[PDB]
Symmetry: C3
Subunit: 327 residues, 3 copies
């Protein structure tokens, strides 16, 4: 596959988070939302990762210091199209440019890879989902099947204002192409701002093809504007991790009362009781039993160990066959 | 708005509660069901709050001693109409009389205020909800839109026995009017008891108008006859409180595993982990972090304090920047 | 009612459990799945309980040593029909033979009793459920209402491949009859194996009647092939136990955060807070209060005792009016 860079849009104010911490730094399973997106970008092979931010520059730079990111400031809040224009000067004409959002944390590498496979030569790869209630969401215009553009809800007509397929806002296309379309955006809009969604029509008019793809899960493209929404995505992710673990052979006594905020390495026949929380990197050897309510953090627990209820195990390497607690 | 008194009906036996404690004293989020209703009545401005009880007089008087209630005994279990008759002698002819139930704890002040606004001069304000399965629930009779009466299920005909709009049983009307209708109730019924729902027709026949209103939430009018029903309402309330907190900026790591049984005052960027229980009046300063499983009761926790997992903090005022526990 | 024996089919490999412990020994609420089935069989009065197993003979014999079971080995994995043939030599011609599965743990005695009542003289009693998505499940063939046979999905035609009523695989019939049909099974099938479901047609052809019955709950007939499925059944069972307790008068502050893995004996007005786990045989006297997160195991707790949060009470008999913990 061709070289590619990634643009991560994190320019919003995050007002409904009612917080002093930049919205995209709020954590999902212990890792900042944007870090989840940055890791997926790196896993894909992004040659560069451009991060476009509104305010909170210092906090962001401070928090993401361990990553090699190209910081792109968006002086004013003029929308995604305007934000992409600020990054455009850094796009190579050889590479594909994938655009993601710092507040859509669960987007999977697997899905982004198919989006990358479906991008036609000279065209665009568009990620979309079938939602019955497009109210608010931008609608996908098609002609005899093929994608023609996107019509922003406020700009959609009653007639088209009931199209079901929705724009996730995630897409990929060649850098030179992107630079071209981005230059041709305009403000004579519902809200005097450049619409990034316009590049879809611009590319259709140039006679280029735009292929639409769908994610395995709707959760992969859910965005976060407030804490009620983050908690909801947190639950979906925990639930997904729990199901994978049970299918993989780890007995969770109640997957709805389990939280993994890190990386779990486990052996065979491990049992985890209710309300357990796993943090950082944790390894549980074969037949380890974790009592209800334990918090295991950055520790390695040997084969056959048993941890009593409500034990906090931190920065510990525990010898095999251990018996931790009274019970 | 006009002066008004409130009648709280708590006359049932509560047999399906299988308890020695009067049903309406059973708690929802730490406060007796009837106390929730009594507080909503006081918040509305009730000049008087009449409490109609079957047995358990002593326990009730003992438990509600800190309230200024007019105790109305209903010697025998002859239904709501009969119960209202026992209170009627205390209604002023100047005031409106609002009738509520001691076992419908979540009725909101906001809703009762609109019910009070929709009551026509000389008429009745009726609270009703759209339920697809009126089986058991009394049906709302209408003619060209306007309310005509209520037909008790056992007294409803197959034809009308499929009306969807249901009678919540909560209503408001002038005291003199109420005294009049109440005097004209009869027993030649399906069960030889006075039907309070009859006053609706009686008032229609007098050529007076009865306006129907709906609550913001169905939970607001759910009644409790057994503990399975109370637990269900407890969960709905907890869930509602959790959502408000998250939207207000408090990070709950799992709103489904959080319980507020009192009043929470909080600052900015507070984090509450799973399985935390808040009781009585609690204040959490800015950036306080509550570890998983803590029980915070009648305490004040200073800015920046961190409470380790499974800590019980009671009747404590904790100094800012505190570090409570091992972790 | 007539004498009857039971055949418990536990011959599968349990590959998707990814465990060294035989699938049917995995626990549901603290008791092995097969033990649940064995207890229901004994409660019904089974004169004998034949256990048919594939591998893991030693572990099974070791684990079920306290039961008087007739061990029937199924040398190769040739399906249920073949498995039943291995047990057939032990069926009496006088008794009814009920067949159950070691991995369908929640089947209730009540339901099995009705299945036993609906079995016609000389016929079969079949347990079936209405499922909209028979994909995979064997379909029930009927003619003018009466059952005619079962058609395995892979052997079902497009036309019949959309019958809704499904075969739970649980059935009962006379031993002599069973011995006869079992002898007439064949391999010229979709997968060269004997189909136990064939006995339905064989019995119809002999002009005998087969009556179908349904369980109170769909959970009663759900089978377990992997740990995600076991956890799901665990939750359903816990939820059912919690509801019975609340309806019976025990206040559970959150039935979704309660686990009973044994037998609870309780008095009046007991209160159990969130995240409590009950194990083995536990008795809670009148008005006992269990704080959040306690683990009560094989203990008796006297009237009026109060147990503070996160207390583990094990193998203890606690004197009445006790105050256990700091709070």
């Amino acid at each position: 596959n061709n070289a590619m860079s990634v643009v991560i849009l994190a320019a919003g104010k995050g007002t409904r988070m009612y917080s002093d911490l930049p919205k995209v730094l709020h954590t999902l399973a212990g890792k900042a939302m944007v870090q989840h997106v940055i890791d997926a970008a790196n896993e894909l092979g992004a040659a560069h990762v451009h991060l476009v931010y509104g305010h909170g520059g210092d906090l962001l730079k401070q928090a993401l210091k361990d990553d090699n990111l190209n910081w792109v400031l968006q002086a004013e809040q003029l929308g995604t199209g305007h934000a992409m224009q600020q990054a455009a000067p850094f796009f190579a004409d050889d590479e594909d440019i994938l655009m993601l959002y710092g507040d859509v944390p669960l987007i999977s590498v697997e899905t982004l890879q198919r989006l990358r496979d479906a991008k036609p030569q000279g065209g665009i790869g568009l990620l979309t989902v079938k939602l019955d209630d497009p109210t608010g969401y931008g609608r996908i215009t098609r002609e005899n099947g093929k994608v023609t553009g996107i019509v922003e809800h406020k700009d959609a007509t009653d007639e088209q204002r009931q199209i079901q397929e929705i724009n996730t806002g995630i897409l990929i296309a060649n850098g030179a192409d992107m630079k071209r379309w981005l230059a041709k955006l305009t403000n004579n809009n519902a809200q005097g701002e450049y619409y990034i969604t316009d590049i879809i029509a611009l590319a259709y008019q140039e006679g280029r093809e735009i292929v639409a793809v769908h994610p395995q899960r709707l959760s992969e493209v859910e965005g976060v504007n407030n804490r009620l929404q983050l908690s909801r995505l947190e639950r979906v992710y925990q639930s997904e991790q729990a199901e994978k673990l049970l299918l993989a052979g780890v007995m969770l006594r109640d997957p709805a009362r389990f939280d993994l905020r890190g990386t779990l390495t486990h052996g065979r026949d491990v049992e985890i009781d209710t309300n357990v929380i796993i943090e950082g990197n944790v390894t549980l050897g074969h037949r380890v039993k974790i009592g209800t309510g334990c918090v295991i953090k950055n520790s390695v627990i040997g084969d056959d160990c048993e941890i009593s209820p409500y034990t906090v195990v931190e920065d510990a390497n525990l010898a095999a066959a251990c018996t931790i607690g009274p019970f």
